Write a protein that binds this ligand. Structure first.
Ligand SMILES: CC(=O)N[C@@H]1[C@@H](O)[C@H](O)[C@@H](CO)O[C@H]1O
Ligand SMILES: CC(=O)N[C@@H]1[C@@H](O)[C@H](O)[C@@H](CO)O[C@H]1O
Ligand SMILES: CC(=O)N[C@@H]1[C@@H](O)[C@H](O)[C@@H](CO)O[C@H]1O
Ligand SMILES: CC(=O)N[C@@H]1[C@@H](O)[C@H](O)[C@@H](CO)O[C@H]1O
Ligand SMILES: CC(=O)N[C@@H]1[C@@H](O)[C@H](O)[C@@H](CO)O[C@H]1O
Ligand SMILES: CC(=O)N[C@@H]1[C@@H](O)[C@H](O)[C@@H](CO)O[C@H]1O
Ligand SMILES: CC(=O)N[C@@H]1[C@@H](O)[C@H](O)[C@@H](CO)O[C@H]1O
Ligand SMILES: CC(=O)N[C@@H]1[C@@H](O)[C@H](O)[C@@H](CO)O[C@H]1O
Ligand SMILES: CC(=O)N[C@@H]1[C@@H](O)[C@H](O)[C@@H](CO)O[C@H]1O
Ligand SMILES: CC(=O)N[C@@H]1[C@@H](O)[C@H](O)[C@@H](CO)O[C@H]1O
Ligand SMILES: CC(=O)N[C@@H]1[C@@H](O)[C@H](O)[C@@H](CO)O[C@H]1O
Ligand SMILES: CC(=O)N[C@@H]1[C@@H](O)[C@H](O)[C@@H](CO)O[C@H]1O
Ligand SMILES: CC(=O)N[C@@H]1[C@@H](O)[C@H](O)[C@@H](CO)O[C@H]1O
Lengths: 138, 408, 186
């Protein structure tokens, strides 16, 4: 993140790190995005839906673009043009009944903590010191 | 009292949607590049990890907020090459394709108006300003060419003036009013939009709601950074100056004083950001609600879309939020009329159908509410229920039966 | 996290209170114990603070869920995309471990066709507007359809109304409005 491709990220392997680490310095698979230096993904000029978001309009995904991770500018959806006119109206002649599911959280686990026990356990000496902290436990 | 005229009022509502996606390297903020300090920091367990997670969660929500507000359209709709919308001019709110950065004129005003690290970084948003503009453009194109139909399935083309007729009907004003006053309405609309340009340029506080968010975040970071020089009871605020002067057993004491103070300062920052995040999330949820109910439909909720009766809403992008241009119908130039709950005709109590009985003192008429358009009282625009000894305010008059002259 | 912090040893000789107390004398143990108390108290305060913030999130969700129950299940909401995409018809609640699940049943206007339209019909100098419908044409005949379904009726004086003359409406087209009384009398 925030790193310039090939200029900066190729500092660490100077210490001769594991062969399976230093591989992430090889060119061709190095792409510069506004989020930083992306190494190991194949940049393409295609567009797709967001899969794994990177930032600044860039996303990555795994394709089988065959058996590899690719980087691309995400699409915002299909292009559509409404046939607008002064007198053209479209009207549905059929319909469908769609059932969709909405999930909403309502509650949490009702936890409770015995402050004195958590902090002091069963120690008398500790409890005597804890009392010097007034009402914090209460 | 019944209005005889009306005006088309356009107002702006400003809502924050997101914050700057900051992130803090707790170890670097507290310890810098000092090995000794890091070794002591480890004695504080997971405090650093927990703080990192909290900030990460906030940063993620900022994209969720933006996504929910703007990405409400399945397809990116474009406007036609011929912008004939029955006299309604949207050129100030729609993108200008001759300049590939637009962002319509109003949007440009919004962006123009609103205005070296130690472990502190700033992450970019997933959606760029251009991407947000594309979503906004699609929503505008949909609204204009297919009304609200695109928000409930496929976009169904309809002439703009006809769309307005439905929007007028939706507020209790008969479709004929629009068509008869279409030129007036289009002109009132076009002028109202022009006024928005002046309102935004004239009033420096118009976008204060967005600027406040930016200012609050800037102050939070300025405070977080300044605390590094506080010297929380230590001989020096600089870790290097402590380490370069004192030996191990002495430096550890001075370093621990700074670690405690810096950790407390960082915890304070994160806590405040979580609280602020909830405020922004609530705002984003409201903005998303308005997008759905004001832009993708015609809300009937009072003062949910500016003052007056809601007709339309046109979204505009903004640096860290959304701007809604709410178009409402506002009654004007009311006159006093005499009224009654019912007409007494041949012993029968006649009640109006979707209208009110009014009088100029000599003649009684049936007129639609919220506009005043008096009709002759007939058996087509009234109904009968009960006799005339029950209704308190009933008045005696003649109800016209249009069949009579057809037979006699 | 709250539990793991117990073994953190916040600058003390040991993370275990018993080991400190069993090893050091009173005036020495008190110092080591106080270090652990401060760290554990801070850790617990952190936990509670986070729970209060998270609790507020859940409360907001519960308030939304309660709102949806009332407006989606106990009635028919007219709020757009408040009950899934499409026009809301019904909602059926289902329980879940720590939440609620709503099955939203909506109407979707599929399979549209392109028709020619007009804001009004010009008949004998009178401007006829539709009653709760739209005037459409297949190119040879004009009909009145209901919106969101397409069900063309003959244009009559029962499903239209008259307002003004025909020199005002911009998109008005000339056609014949049928009067069902005529054949009853003639
Ligand atoms: C990733 C990046 O910003 N690289 C810049 C490069 O674009 C610029 O041209 C050069 C100076 O000429 O300095 C590099 O650090
Ligand atoms: C802008 C861009 O990257 N265009 C590439 C082109 O350079 C490459 O030769 C070709 C191979 O199929 O694929 C295109 O997407
Ligand atoms: C008028 C029309 O197209 N009706 C079709 C029906 O014939 C078909 O069997 C069904 C799917 O089974 O979908 C309906 O929309
Ligand atoms: C019935 C009526 O008063 N209509 C007036 C119109 O004459 C005037 O030109 C316009 C402002 O230009 O405001 C309308 O309310
Ligand atoms: C107030 C207003 O909308 N003025 C626009 C003007 O900016 C535009 O250049 C022109 C193009 O025909 O149409 C006018 O209605
Ligand atoms: C709409 C209207 O005409 N309202 C008038 C008001 O202006 C006048 O002051 C009052 C008598 O004092 O009588 C009302 O009917
Ligand atoms: C008090 C009053 O204004 N009465 C007028 C009457 O003079 C006029 O002839 C009629 C239309 O023909 O409309 C009535 O409202
Ligand atoms: C609707 C109606 O007839 N209201 C009358 C009012 O006109 C009259 O001035 C008043 C005298 O006390 O008694 C009310 O019931
Ligand atoms: C105050 C008043 O005018 N009351 C008359 C009532 O005496 C008459 O019997 C009735 C028609 O039968 O019409 C009412 O308007
Ligand atoms: C519902 C419908 O028929 N839409 C058609 C569209 O398919 C066609 O592509 C376009 C001309 O290009 O004209 C529209 O009226
Ligand atoms: C262009 C067209 O489809 N015209 C048909 C016409 O041929 C048919 O006879 C009539 C029903 O009788 O319905 C019209 O819509
Ligand atoms: C509803 C209506 O008549 N719209 C007409 C359109 O059919 C015509 O092609 C155009 C020519 O400029 O002028 C519009 O006013
Ligand atoms: C474009 C067109 O057909 N205009 C005719 C108009 O010339 C005629 O006078 C009127 C009936 O009086 O019907 C209109 O449809």
């Amino acid at each position: 993140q925030g790193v310039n491709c090939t200029e900066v990220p190729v500092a660490i392997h100077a210490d001769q790190l594991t062969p399976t680490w230093r591989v992430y310095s090889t060119g061709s698979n190095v792409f510069q995005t506004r989020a930083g230096c992306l190494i190991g993904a194949e940049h393409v000029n295609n567009s797709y839906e967001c899969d794994i978001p990177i930032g600044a309009g860039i996303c990555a995904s795994y394709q089988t673009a065959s058996q590899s991770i690719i980087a691309y500018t995400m699409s915002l959806g299909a292009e559509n043009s409404v046939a607008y006119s002064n007198n053209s109206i479209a009207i549905p002649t059929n319909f469908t009944i769609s059932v969709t599911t909405e999930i909403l959280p309502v509650s949490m686990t009702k936890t409770s903590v015995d402050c004195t026990m958590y902090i002091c356990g069963d120690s008398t000496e500790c409890s005597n010191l804890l009392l010097q902290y007034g009402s914090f436990c209460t | 009292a019944i209005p005889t005229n009306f005006t088309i009022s356009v107002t702006t509502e400003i809502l924050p949607v997101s914050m700057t996606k900051t992130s803090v390297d707790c170890t670097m903020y507290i310890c810098g590049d000092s090995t000794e300090c890091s070794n002591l920091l480890l004695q504080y367990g997971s405090f650093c990890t927990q703080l990192n997670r909290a900030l990460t969660g906030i940063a993620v929500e900022q994209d969720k907020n933006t996504q929910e507000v703007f990405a409400q359209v399945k397809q990116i709709y474009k406007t036609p090459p011929i912008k004939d919308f029955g006299g309604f001019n949207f050129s100030q709110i729609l993108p200008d394709p001759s300049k590939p950065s637009k962002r319509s004129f109003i949007e440009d005003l919004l962006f123009n108006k609103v205005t070296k690290f130690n472990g502190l970084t700033v992450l970019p948003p997933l959606l760029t300003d251009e991407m947000i503009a594309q979503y906004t453009s699609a929503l505008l194109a949909g609204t204009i060419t297919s009304g609200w139909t695109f928000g409930a399935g496929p976009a169904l083309q309809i002439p703009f003036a006809m769309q307005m007729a439905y929007r007028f009907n939706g507020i209790g004003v008969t479709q004929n009013v629009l068509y008869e006053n279409q030129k007036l309405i289009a002109n009132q609309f076009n002028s109202a939009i022009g006024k928005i340009q002046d309102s935004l340029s004239s009033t420096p506080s118009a976008l204060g709601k967005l600027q406040d968010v930016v200012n609050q975040n800037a102050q939070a970071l300025n405070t977080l950074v300044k605390q590094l020089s506080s010297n929380f009871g230590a001989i020096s605020s600089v870790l290097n100056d402590i380490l370069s002067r004192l030996d191990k057993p002495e430096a550890e004491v001075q370093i621990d004083r700074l670690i405690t103070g810096r950790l407390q300062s960082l915890q304070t920052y994160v806590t405040q950001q979580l609280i602020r995040a909830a405020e922004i999330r609530a705002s984003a949820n409201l903005a998303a609600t308005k997008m759905s109910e004001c832009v993708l439909g015609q809300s009937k909720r009072v003062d949910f879309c500016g003052k007056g009766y809601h007709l339309m809403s046109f979204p505009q992008s903004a640096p860290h939020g959304v701007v809604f241009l709410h178009v409402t119908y506002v009654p004007a130039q009311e006159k006093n009329f005499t009224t009654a709950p019912a007409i007494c005709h041949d012993g029968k109590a006649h009640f109006p159908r979707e209208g009110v009985f009014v009088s100029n003192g000599t003649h009684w008429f049936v007129t639609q509410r919220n506009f005043y358009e008096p009709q002759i009282i007939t058996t087509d625009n009234t109904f009968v229920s009960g006799n005339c000894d029950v209704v308190i305010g009933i008045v005696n008059n003649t109800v016209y039966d249009p069949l009579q002259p057809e037979l006699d």
